[PDB]
Design a protein around this ligand. Structure first.
Ligand SMILES: CN1CCN(Cc2ccc(-c3c[nH]c4ccncc34)c(OCCc3ccc(-c4cccc5ccncc45)cc3)c2)CC1
Lengths: 143, 139, 143
C-alpha cells in the first residue's frame, strides 16, 4: 500500500508548547508524509481524512472566563494560500478549587494538493495535558 | 485496478433536514441511501455536526445512526449508533457545537441499502467545528 | 475478495458491568487472520493498521462530585508483553436522577508487529450502555 498516512503526537520534552513528533511508541510518518516546522507535508494530490484531538486541564475557575481553541489550517504552495479547514472554541468555566477537563476533537475529509502543509494549533499550551501517552494527536489518512 | 467507493456530503440548502449529495465503481446514491454494488467487506463511516442556541434544559439528546436495509428481508438494522447529551447546567445563552463520528467494517451484500440519520435535523450545522458526510469504501 | 486482515468486534450485551468483545454475532467479524483471544485483538502480520473504537456511557443523575470517563486503546508488545497506550480520551459528564449520555470515538494509524495484542478498555464499565446494537465496537484494518 502506497497511500500517504501520518499519526503524530504531542512532544512531552517540549511542555508549554504543542510541538508534534512522530514518537516511537504510538506515532509515525509513512509513504511521503514529512513533518516540517511543526506541520504535516502532503506528498500528493487527493482526498484525505484529517483529524486531531487535544485535551486541556486546569485546576479551578478563577479571574475571568477562559477560552480554549483548536485549529487545523492548510497552506498551499501556490501564493502560500492559508485557509482554516477546521476550528472549535470551548469555555471550560461557568464561575468559581476542583480540576476541569476540556477535550477538543476535530476531523473531516478534504481535497489536498502536493506540497500542502497542515498545522494543528492551540491558543493555550499552558493548559495542555501531558498526563497519558495518547490523548494529544494529529493525523492524515489518504482515502 | 479499483474498488467501490462513495463519499457523499449533506445539502446546506435542505433546511431542517439531512439530505445527501454526490461516488464510484457501482456505489449509487438512491432514495437518500447508499446502494452496495457487490458482496464484500466495506468500511462505512459518517460525521454529523449539531449546534444549539444555548442550554435551556439538560434533557436535549442528540443521536446519529447508520442502518442497513437488507435486500432479502427489507428490515432496518442498526450498524453504528451514538447518543450525546450536549447540555450540563443552564445569563446570555451561548451556542454549543457537537460533532458525532461513526465508522466500522461490515460484510455487505449486493443491493444492501445504507442510511445515515439524526434525531435532531433542526440542530444540523455546517460550521468548521466539523463536517457533514457519509461514505463507504470497499476493502 | 479482500486479503487484508480486518476485524469489527462488538460488546456483549449480557456481560453485566463489563466490556467483553464478541465476533460471529449478527454484524461483527474477524477476517484474514485476526483472532480474538483474552478480550484482545491479535495481529497476524507486521504493518500499518487503521485502529478505531467507540464506547457509549450512560448515567442517571450526577453523584459523588465529578466522575471521569476514559477510553483507551493499548498495544501489548509480543516480545516483552509491555502495555503501551496508542489512543486515549477523557470525558467529564457532570458539571456540578436525570439520564446523561456520553460517546467516546477513537481512531488512528499505527505500526503493529505479528502477534501484537490490542485492547480497548474503559475505566467505568458500570456506566457502559450496550442496551441497543452499534453502540460499543472495536476494529482494525490493515493498510
Ligand atoms: C484502506 N483504506 C481504507 C479507508 N481509508 C480512509 C479512511 C476513511 C474513513 C475513516 C473513518 C472511520 N471512522 C470515521 C468516522 C468519521 N470520519 C471518518 C472515519 C478512516 O478511519 C481510519 C481510522 C480513524 C477513524 C476515525 C478518525 C476520526 C475521524 C473524524 C474525526 C476524528 C477526531 C478525533 N479523532 C479521530 C477522528 C480517525 C482515524 C479511514 C484509507 C485506506
Amino acid at each position: 500500500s502506497d497511500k500517504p498516512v501520518a499519526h503524530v503526537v504531542a512532544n512531552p520534552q517540549a511542555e508549554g508548547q504543542l510541538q508534534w513528533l512522530n514518537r516511537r511508541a504510538n506515532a509515525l510518518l509513512a509513504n511521503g508524509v514529512e513533518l516540517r516546522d511543526n506541520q504535516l507535508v502532503v506528498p500528493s494530490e487527493g482526498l484525505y481524512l484529517i483529524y486531531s484531538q487535544v485535551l486541556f486541564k486546569g485546576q479551578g475557575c478563577p479571574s475571568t472566563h477562559v477560552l480554549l481553541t483548536h485549529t487545523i489550517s492548510r497552506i498551499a504552495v501556490s501564493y502560500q494560500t492559508k485557509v482554516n479547514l477546521l476550528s472549535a472554541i470551548k469555555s471550560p468555566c461557568q464561575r468559581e478549587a476542583k480540576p476541569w477537563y476540556e477535550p477538543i476533537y476535530l476531523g473531516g475529509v478534504f481535497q489536498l494538493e502536493k506540497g500542502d502543509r497542515l498545522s494543528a494549533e492551540i491558543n493555550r499550551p499552558d493548559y495542555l495535558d501531558f498526563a497519558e501517552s495518547g490523548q494529544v494527536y494529529f493525523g492524515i489518512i489518504a482515502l
